[PDB]
Amino acid sequence: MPAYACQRPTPLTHHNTGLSEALEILAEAAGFEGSEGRLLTFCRAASVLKALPSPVTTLSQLQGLPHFGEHSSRVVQELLEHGVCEEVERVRRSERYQTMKLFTQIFGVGVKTADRWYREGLRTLDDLREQPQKLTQQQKAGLQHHQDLSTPVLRSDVDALQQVVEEAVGQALPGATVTLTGGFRRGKLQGHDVDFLITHPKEGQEAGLLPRVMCRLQDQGLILYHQHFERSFCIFRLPQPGSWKAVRVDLVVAPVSQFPFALLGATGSKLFQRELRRFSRKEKGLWLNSHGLFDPEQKTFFQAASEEDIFRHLGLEYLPPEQRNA
DNA sequence: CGGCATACG
DNA sequence: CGTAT
DNA sequence: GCCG
Ligand SMILES: [Mg+2]
Ligand SMILES: [Mg+2]
Ligand SMILES: [Mg+2]
Ligand SMILES: [Mg+2]
Ligand code: NA
């Protein structure tokens, strides 16, 4: 088992679901307390289990696996022996965890804002609605639409949204293309948002595109919220039988020369990209981001034509999106 | 021990 | 500060 | 919390 998540296939569904979910609870709780190092380790340990070819049934099977030390091993041991881990259950039922989870799930609210509100004594969404002076317009949108945004987005919803985005993109810039990214490109059947990447085959033609797209979507009555650039974080109005629902949609524009890097970054998973960038810098001496791959010794950028190119240039076996579910 | 991904709105 | 993968 |  290699130590970096980008060195091993990680499928969407796997053989250690309960064990990984418990470790991910501890990762999430670590983040609510600002402990980014412990969040990473618990996330990494969870991802190792997702990469295994069969269920862990005995503690001996953790020996030699990366990112399993005393703490993550004890969690697994308790789950295997009793079906429950006391630490995990204590976190799950704690007022701090449940409220930070509730608050951070609001669009426009992060850990720092949620923590401040928690310390001020706030606990519920109605507590927040009773004091709109404390809210940004973004938070107001997130709170107004919270119920809809808590409902899973389905793959049928994605097809409908892609068509309306393509329509607006086609008027804004003929020949521009729309690619589905994020979790749905990795094969997820549900999600909490839809992610798209837009480019144009002629380098430079994509300049100024996203304002033109957003203006056209807003004119069509499809935009319930947006920030108004090259990234937009929108709430869309999606038709439903006899009504509609609010859906989070993210749009990204990249020049075609950067498209492989932007596609790689936007396809994720989040942990996969963190691990890939860590691997690039620490093992290969190259600096990876959503725009390119930089050799800081020669001061040159690697021209990729495909994701396959990028994996080859990092000396990694290629992984299709469906195997990047770290 | 230091390090833990990286960018844009 | 927020957002995203 | 774990790795190198
Ligand atoms: Mg997504
Ligand atoms: Mg998104
Ligand atoms: Mg230390
Ligand atoms: Mg997200
Ligand atoms: Na949030």
Residue with tokens 């006899």: A242
Strand D footprint nucleotides (protein C-beta < 7 Å): 1-4
Q: Determine the CATH number of domain A152-256.
A: 3.30.460.10
- The Cβ-side half-sphere exposure at A147, using a 13 Å CA radius, reads 4
- Dihedral angle of Cα A72, A78, A80, A82, to the nearest 10 degrees: -160
Q: Give the full edge-to-edge strand order of the sheet including A300-301.
A: A287-289, A292-295, A300-301
Among all strands, which nt has the closest C1' to A230 (CA)? B8
- The Cβ-side half-sphere exposure at A254, using a 13 Å CA radius, reads 20
Distance A228 CA to C3 C1' (A): 14
Q: Which fold has domain A1-94?
A: DNA polymerase; domain 1 (1.10.150)
Residues A22, A28, A32, A37: is their CA dihedral positive or negative?
positive
Contacts of A176 (CB under 8 A, 6+ apart): A169, A170, A198, A199, A200, A205, A206, A209
* Spatial contact of A42 and A26, defined as CB atoms under 8 Å apart: yes
Distance A277 CA to B6 C1' (A): 8
Which residues, in sequence order, are bridge partners of residue A246?
Answer: A237
Task: State the architecture of A257-325 in CATH terms.
Answer: 2-Layer Sandwich (3.30)
Among candidate residues A127, A250, A295, A309, the one labeled active-site is: A250
What is the C-alpha separation between A39 and A20, in angstroms, rounded?
13
User: SS3 for A264?
Assistant: helix
- In this chain, the answer to whether the domains covering A1-94 and A95-151 adopt an identical fold is yes
Q: What is the resolution of this structure in A?
A: 1.6
Q: How was this structure determined?
A: X-ray
Q: Which fold has domain A95-151?
A: DNA polymerase; domain 1 (1.10.150)
Q: Which ligand has the nearest atom to the CA of A182?
A: 1
Is A126 an active-site residue?
A: no
What is the C-alpha separation between A166 and A176, in angstroms, rounded?
8
- Residue A115 annotated as lining a ligand binding site: no
* Spatial contact of A202 and A193, defined as CB atoms under 8 Å apart: no
Looking at chain A, which runs of residues are DSSP E strands?
153-154, 177-180, 190-191, 194-199, 223-225, 231-240, 243-253, 287-289, 292-295, 300-301
Domain boundaries, chain A: 1-94, 95-151, 152-256, 257-325
